[PDB]
Symmetry: D2
Subunit: 333 residues, 4 copies
C-alpha cells in the first residue's frame, strides 16, 4: 500500500524524491529487480517499496509554486535539481499556500486550511522540507500534522523531535514524529570522519585537517581536533546548482614523524543526498502510523544528525531491532 504524502516545502529535495520515485517505477517496467536499484539501502520497509509514493498535498509560499499543479511546481525555478528524463505522472492536485509567520498559532485560518487539507487528502506523512532557520514553521506544521493525526518528518536542524513536550504529545496520540535533521546519504562529513577514524585507529598523529564545501542552490544560499578547521560555506558557485563539491586535506604524522598527506574531492547531487535518506524516514513514518507506533522510531537514527534522545543513547542494535519489529509487525499486522 502506497504512502499518501503531504509536503511542506516544494524544493530541490522534493524534485529529487518525486522524479526519483518515477525513475525507479520505470526501471521496474524495463525489468530491473529492486535488489539492483542504485542508491537504495532498504528496498522494502514494512512492505513499502521506494516507488510506493503518492503525493496528495503540498504547501509553498513561492509565486512560481503556489496554485501551480504539483508536477510543474516541483520543476519550477528556482529548483535546479536536474530533469532526470522520465515522464512524471500528474497526481491531480495543485500546491496549496503555506503558513506565513503570523499564521503560526493553531487558531489561525491558514492553520485551519492545512489541518483540513491533510484530513481531506487522507495524508499519512507530512514531509517538512523548508529552509533551515524557521523554528516557528517546524513547530506550526508539526501541530497541524499532530491535530490531523498525520506522521511528521523533520529534514531540518530545527528542534521538533528534540523539544521534549511536543514529542510527549505525538507519543500520546499514536502518531510518529521522525526528527531531527537529515544526515546526507553520503556527505562531506561522513567521508571526512571515516578518514580521521582510520588515522587514529592505526595510531597515526593528526597535524591538521580542513574541509570546505561549494554549492549553487537555494539551500546553500540560505545557509551562507586542535587544528581541524571546518568551513561548511566556502562559497556560493551559481553554475554548480544542486551539485555540492567538498575538498578536504588531512596531514597525519607516521613513524618517526614522517608526513602522511591525504587530498580528497567529493562531488554529489546534494538533493539526492536528501532523497536517499527521506525515502527511509518517509517509510519509517508511514509503516509506524499504520501499526500505531507513535513518537520517535529508533529505525530513523542512522540517517539523522539530531535524532530524539541523541546519538549517544543508541547502538546500531537498537536501530536494527526497530527495523525488525516494524517489518515483523507489518507482516503480522
Amino acid at each position: 500500500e502506497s504512502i499518501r504524502l503531504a509536503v511542506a516545502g516544494v524544493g530541490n529535495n522534493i524534485s529529487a524524491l518525486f522524479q526519483g520515485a518515477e525513475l525507479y517505477r520505470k526501471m521496474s517496467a524495463e525489468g530491473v529487480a529492486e535488489a539492483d536499484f542504485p542508491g537504495i539501502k532498504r528496498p522494502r520497509i514494512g512492505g513499502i517499496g521506494v516507488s510506493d509514493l503518492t503525493f496528495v498535498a503540498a504547501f509553498d509560499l513561492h509565486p512560481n509554486k503556489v496554485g501551480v499543479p504539483f508536477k510543474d511546481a516541483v520543476l519550477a525555478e528556482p529548483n535546479n535539481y536536474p530533469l532526470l528524463g522520465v515522464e512524471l505522472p500528474d497526481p491531480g492536485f495543485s500546491v496549496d499556500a503555506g503558513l506565513t509567520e503570523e499564521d503560526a498559532d493553531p487558531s489561525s485560518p491558514a492553520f485551519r486550511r492545512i489541518v483540513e487539507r491533510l484530513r481531506e487528502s487522507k495524508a499519512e506523512v507530512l514531509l517538512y522540507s523548508l529552509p533551515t532557520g524557521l523554528q516557528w514553521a517546524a513547530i506550526a506544521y508539526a501541530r497541524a500534522a499532530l491535530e490531523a493525526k498525520v506522521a511528521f518528518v523533520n529534514c531540518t536542524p530545527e528542534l521538533v523531535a528534540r523539544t521534549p513536550e511536543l514529542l510527549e504529545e505525538f507519543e500520546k496520540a499514536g502518531v510518529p514524529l521522525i526528527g531531527d535533521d537529515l544526515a546526507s546519504h553520503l556527505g562531506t562529513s561522513v567521508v571526512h570522519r571515516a578518514l580521521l577514524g582510520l588515522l587514529s585507529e592505526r595510531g597515526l598523529s593528526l597535524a591538521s585537517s580542513y574541509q570546505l564545501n561549494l554549492g549553487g542552490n537555494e539551500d546553500f544560499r540560505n545557509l551562507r581536533t586542535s587544528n581541524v578547521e571546518v568551513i561548511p560555506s566556502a562559497g556560493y558557485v551559481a553554475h554548480l546548482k544542486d551539485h555540492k563539491v567538498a575538498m578536504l586535506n588531512i596531514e597525519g604524522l607516521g613513524w618517526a614523524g614522517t608526513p602522511v598527506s591525504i587530498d580528497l574531492k567529493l562531488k554529489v547531487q546534494d538533493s539526492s543526498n536528501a532523497a536517499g535518506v527521506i525515502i527511509d524516514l518517509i517509510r519509517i513514518a508511514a509503516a509506524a502510523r499504520r501499526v500505531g507506533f507513535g513518537g520517535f522510531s529508533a529505525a530513523a537514527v542512522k540517517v539523522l544528525k539530531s535524532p530524539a534522545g541523541g546519538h549517544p543513547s543508541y547502538t546500531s542494535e537498537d536501530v536494527a531491532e526497530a527495523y525488525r519489529q516494524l517489518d515483523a509487525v507489518t507482516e503480522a499486522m
Copy 2:
C-alpha cells in the same frame, strides 16, 4: 629491557627503524612523553618502549653494506629513506655476509656462521627484511633463527608462519614465529577499502573504482568489484625515492542513479609505513620469547596481511586478549 635485534636485509625499512628509534630517544631527552609520540599505536608492549632497541647483528649481500659498520651500511646507497637528522649511535658491529641461494641448506658453512652469529650476539629477534620473491631465503633465515632459539619476524609475502610444518617446529621450541607480510601503517589499500566500505554501508551502488601507486625505491623496483581495477605498480618514478604516491577514483551511484564521485591522493614515507608496524611485531616477538610463548601471536594479526591461521579465523577481541595476556604475563613474569 632493550630488544637485542638481528636483521636479515639492511634496506629502507631498517634505515627507517634504526633512525626512527634514535629520533624517539632524542624526543625523550627534549622532554616529550611517549603519549605524545607521533605515529605510535602502542607506546609500550610487555614494558618495551619504541626506543628500547639494540642492533646486535646484520646480514646483507650488497657490497656497499657487507663488512661496513652498521651505522654506515643502513644509510648506504641504494637506501633512500631520508636522513632524519639525528646523531645515530654506533652500536659497535659490522654487517656480516648473508646467505646466497646455494647456502640454503642448514649444513652449509654460511648457515653455520649465521646460527653462530645469532648465538654470540645473544639476539632475541631476527627481522627478515629481504626483497619479496625469495622463498628459499625466508625458509633458510627462519631455520637459522629456529636452531639459534631466536624469534623470527617475516615482513614479506613469502610463506613462513603460513607453512604449517615450520610453525609446528617453532611452537615446539618455545620460539615465537611472527608472520606473514606487513600491512602498511596506513597504506593505499586500507584507505581504498574504508571508502568502499562507506559506500555500501550507506547503500550507494559502486559503478567503478581504480587505485594506482608510484614509487622510486629498491622495493618498488623489485615488485615492478566487477569494475574495481587495482594497479599496484603504475610506474617507477626515481625522484620519489622511498615516498609512495597513490591516486584513487570511486564512482558511486546515489538516489535516482545520480553520481557520487571521489578523487583521492595519498603521499607517505613508504618505509615509515613498514617501521610503524615492525616496531609492534618486533616487540610482540621479544616479549613472547622472554615469557616462552612460541608459535604465532594473535597480537600480530592487525598489522599483517597474511597472519598464520588467516584473517577469517580472528576477531579483534582475539587480538586485544593476546596484547592483555602478553603485557599481564610480563608485569607478572
Copy 3:
C-alpha cells in the same frame, strides 16, 4: 557542398566523427547557431561546415565491422565511444574488406578493389585511421588514394606526408596530402608543457615532475612516449613521463592524466601543483580531424595539392617540420584557402 569521405579503419575516431556530425546537425534544427557550437575553433573552412560530411566508403579487417552496414559498424564492438543519443542516419553502404599486409603491393586484387571503391564512391578524402605502428598500411592506403586522385589524411605517427618523394608525387598530381600524426584537441602534453612553461618563464626552479595517463580503448591497448618528454624540453633530469600507467577497462574511450610539478621559489620553499585531466579521448581526435578533412577537401576543390600549412597547429609531425612554420604561415593558408574558394 558536402565532403564525400572515405575511411581506412572504423574505430573510436570515426564513431566520434560520425555521431558528432549528426549531433551538430540536430543542434542546427533545435535552433543553435554555428558560432555557439561547442568545441568548434573554425565553424567553416572553404565554406564547409562541421556537419557537411557524407561517408561513402569504409575499410576494416575486424569480423564485427566487415560487411556490416556503416551505421552499425561504427558502434560495433570493440568501439566504446559513447552513444550520443542522436538518430544516426543510414548512409546506405557497407564496410568493405581492407588491405592485409600481403595485399600491400599495388597489383594485389585488394589494392585494385580499393582503388575501384575510391573512384566509384567519388570520395574526395581518404581518412587513414588505423592503429599506430603499421608503416606498410599508411604507405599502401596512401598510394591507393594517390592512384585514384583522392586527398589523404594521416592521423598516425607513420611516415607518409614526411617521405619527401611521396609528397612530391602528391604535390605534382594536384592532390592534397595532410600529415602526419594528430595533435589531440586538448592533450595531456600541451597542459603539462604550459605549466612547466609558467614555472621557467617566471624563473621558478624545477625539482621534479611526473605525468601518467590511463585509458580503456583499443588505441591505448595498442600503444601499450619520447615525443612526450621532448615536448617538455626546463631541467628534465627529474621529469618522468609514463604514457601508459595502466589500462582501466571501465574508462572505455575516456583518457585520464594526472600530473605533479614540484618547483622551488624564493629561499627554496616548495611550489606544488597536482592536476587531473579527464577527456573523451576520441573527441580529442574528431575535434582535430574535422579541421584536417575540411582542409583536405577544400584544397582538392581548389587544386592546392601537397601539404597545406593550415594543418600545422593540429599535427605532431607536419611535412617540413614545425620549426619551418609561424602562426601567420598557418593563418595565411586558412585565409587564402577560404578566400580562393569564395571566387
Copy 4:
C-alpha cells in the same frame, strides 16, 4: 656593493626577504654557484646579487615589533613565515615607530623623525610593505622617501607610482619610484589564466570554472578580487572567483588554490581539469621584491629616476599601464640598466 634597505612594515614579506638573503649567503659558502640558486630568475641586476642586502631601517606599529632589534622583530608574532634554519645575522639596529594616520602630514614629529632616519641610515631604497588598503600611508612613506632622496617600492595596490604628479616629482628629482602592486612570483591567477588560455586558443568551449584560495597569515586576514576576474578576460558568464574561501589558521603563511575548469570539445563531450596549488605566500612576494629592490637601487646609483620598465613583468599596476609595454621594453630596460652600471 650592498643595498642599504629601509622597510615600512616588518611582515611575512620581510621575514621571507631577510631569512632568504641569509639562506643564499649560506649556499654560497657550502659551495653552490648563483646560476644554480633555486627561484632566482636574474642572479644579478646592475651587479647586485640576491644576497647583497643591508637592512638599515625598519618602521612598524605592532608592540611585539616596535623597539625590538630587527633580527627578533622579523620572526616576532604574528609573523608566521617559517624559520629557515640559518644563523640570521644581527644588523645592529632596532625597529623605530612608524607613521599613524594622524602623523600623515609632512610637518608632524613622526614624519620629520622618519625623514631623519632615512637620511641618517643612508638608505637607498624604502620598501613599503604595509597591509593593503592604507592610501594615506603609501602616499606618506612615499613623500618621506622623496624628501630624503630615497628610492620607493610599492608592494601594495595603493596609488603611488600611478599618481602622475608624484611620479613627475620623483622623475625630476633623479629618484626611482617602483610600483604599483606585486604580481606574486607564481600566482593563482596566472595558472588559472594560462589553462583558460589553452582551452580557447585550441577552440574548446568553456562551460564553467571556479578558483578558490585559502590562507592563514595577517595579509589574508586583512584582505578578508575584481583584478582576479579581469585576468581571466573566454566566456566568463560562468567563471567564479572566491579570492577568500576561508582562513585556515594551521596554513600560516602557506596559500592553497583549488581550481576547476569544465570545457566542452567535439560533440559537447566534457574536458575536465581539477588543480591544487600550494605555495609559501610570502616567498611569492620576496621572489619578486628581490627583483624590484635591485631595480630600485641600481637605478638610483645610475640616476635613472621615475619608473623603470624592468619592473613591469613583476607588477599588477605599473606606472603607464601594461598595455603601453612589450617584453622588449622590459628587456631593453634590464640590458641598459646592467650595461650602464658596467661603465
